[PDB]
Amino acid sequence: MREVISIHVGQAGIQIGNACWELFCLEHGIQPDGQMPDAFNTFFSETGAGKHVPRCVFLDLEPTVVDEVRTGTYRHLFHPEQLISGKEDAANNFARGHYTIGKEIVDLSLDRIRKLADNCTGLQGFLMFNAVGGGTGSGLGCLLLERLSVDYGKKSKLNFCSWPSPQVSTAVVEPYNSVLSTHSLLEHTDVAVMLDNEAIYDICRRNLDIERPTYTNLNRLIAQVISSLTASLRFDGALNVDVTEFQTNLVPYPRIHFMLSSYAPIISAEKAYHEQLSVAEITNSAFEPASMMAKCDPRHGKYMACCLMYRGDVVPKDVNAAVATIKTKRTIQFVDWCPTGFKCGINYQPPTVVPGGDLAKVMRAVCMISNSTAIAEVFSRMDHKFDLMYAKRAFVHWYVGEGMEEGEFSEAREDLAALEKDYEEVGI
Template identity: 85%
Template structure:
């Protein structure tokens, strides 16, 4: 530690701004042990010509020697380097970074630094405290008078206060947590959850120093040719639908080995998908999943999409979930499940398949978001003025919900929400993990010019019963938890005002034993729409995922239809003939009845308290 103090001049007033800037950079670089810097290569030049032009600047600027891996200031304009035009990421000593950030917070009000620098620095410091990425751009900081001397003063204070702890201040490789982007025109993104895995943001920063954007590796893996391939698996027991993907517009996007189809379908029979035909493709599915997971440096979990009304989605879907639980233990499984619609039915045996599949979803998913085609169909007709919505229209609307849920994993924001936080904040009890979802604004291109679309308006919209993407009325139940994920031009102040307004409404009621209620996330990336699609491009949007006791309506409708058929044992022989036992029907039905009682008890405890209060009054 003494050698650092020796490097600092006794009087900063005698130094020029340029000298203080250079010394502050060197001081920060000295605090990172050199033995850790050998694994980080400088960013490759764009061409041989650029490499020649920057030969002198690489010698002049220390980080091109591989020693300076941290700098809170951008290169000076008088000495252009590749670093001034390219993302430069580096490992951060957490203690030192927090010290500097805290001091910046203390002095930002007093000094005359620009609002932009104050804002970016404050945002980076908050992310660091929340164990997220303190990524920010301080390009042009070198033009501000006094920055270098201020940094040197901070360093001197830091070294003085940490004299006695110098022996413990060792940066181990496992502590390399957050990349910093310095003097870059675009921020580097982190990459948590893909469809079947995750690239760890704690991985060594050599990829980051070469300018690789982690946002791509969230859901995509890069081939040797530089092509990005979705880390996703498509499975069906009959080839028709998968063949549409193989020959469709996006056929070049997907790896052919990740499109799996059988030779015959499940004929709307859960037992065929689970016990007979489905087992024929199970091994190849698990092998493909294993390969996808092997390409993830730190697997976080799975996103699972299926419909429980048919035979493949219910039978094979349940079989895959069971095997994922065995092979991957406690890895998170977030499901998006299409349930049968109340009025529209595509198969007579939908209630059987749904009850049998829900029995598996209860045990093998951590969070399940319920959807149904009829509810989404009505939203498309009412909000987008589509007279006869197709599956393409429905899918594009559902994709906005999925995109909103995962946006904070792929882009920067003031209050980013990790996938694992859904389970922690939305699931009060293990079995109570079936969620309702809604999205706003759903507005057509023709109507967008007549809508204000303020934060308060779109927040109120997602709580309306006709905005729910499953047919049930949330006003008949009570909220146990609610997650609001905002995208685009949204600030925390407006979110707080909108949430406060919602809390005062009698129609939106929360259970007494969960007083906090809301989990909010804000992401700066505005909503993206498909070119030529039905949805208008809007500056901001919100997606709500809520745990409401009214979701029991979905299960009670299915149970009623199940009971009508099973009382006469109609169609049961088709299931038994595929290797299923009749007792499995009763077991699954009892499990679903127990789930309904669980939801009733959750709401009843709260209702009993209200009755007691009324009697006392």
């Protein structure tokens, strides 16, 4: 009972799994070998003499970034075929990942996910982590959704995307892999959390005050997002929320399932002890329209739903007071078909302290998974890049060369066009 399976694909998937499974290891007390010196059931198992194997698949067509966990300390933690690798990288090619070289590794991925689901006595969700900006994260990741939605139909599939940033790309064919991979995260995904790298850069710049953060520091905060997300699945609290209730009291009409993340007790030790990080101040920094983890301003969008996950020494009287002061402000606005728009959930477990990383010791936390119509702009910015490139048929010989017909470019743009059209239609 109470198991969730994380499914990492793409190189950013392995690295985000190195931080997330790290945090799950501390948050139940597992040593680096896999031994505690049953809250752990969602993430780890019990293999006899205290062994604790994680419930993950690390999936990549390029062996290099999955080899560093196979050669570091945690070959002995992860089961050695739960780290499925390949030979050639998909190489920023959605065609290569989805049609050509992803169709030989997809057998080992589905076989291992099946074995990781047979030892479950009631499974809540599939927390798939990926990055839609490249090759195997856009390709094989999409195909894995096609196979998962047909063998596990009733199963909910959460998905933490890493959607392309506006001015920062680190890839020039990235607009092609983003637009062409919308259909996996529109019809075969029940929760689509949209993250991008720049918003984590800004949070690290002004809140944590690391001026020059690395991707490993970006994986700090996204690890804190899933810990507060699966907080009620593992430790007791005043109000509990499971992944069935995230996708019920937050998700409107079924195509609109695109949510945004905002953790906000982000602070480091030079600031931390000078201020009261109580319930009122951490939730005002949560609704602040510069701490969104999307580079997507909510001040031109309407909040359709919000999910506050307070986590620590938080009293429910202060939660109901904090939702009052955020409801009385005009800069925060809601759709008319929403008298109640908050699913508050409290976990008694304090936020896990970060020795040697970037955060500090805080007694309470908050994370928002909020669906708004502001998210109709993270795809409009990528429309302009797609239409500019596909006007001159740029970069499309690489796609058509492995068996990706030129047709799919047009109705992937058209599918995102109906996605945009669906978003201002709700906000009328």
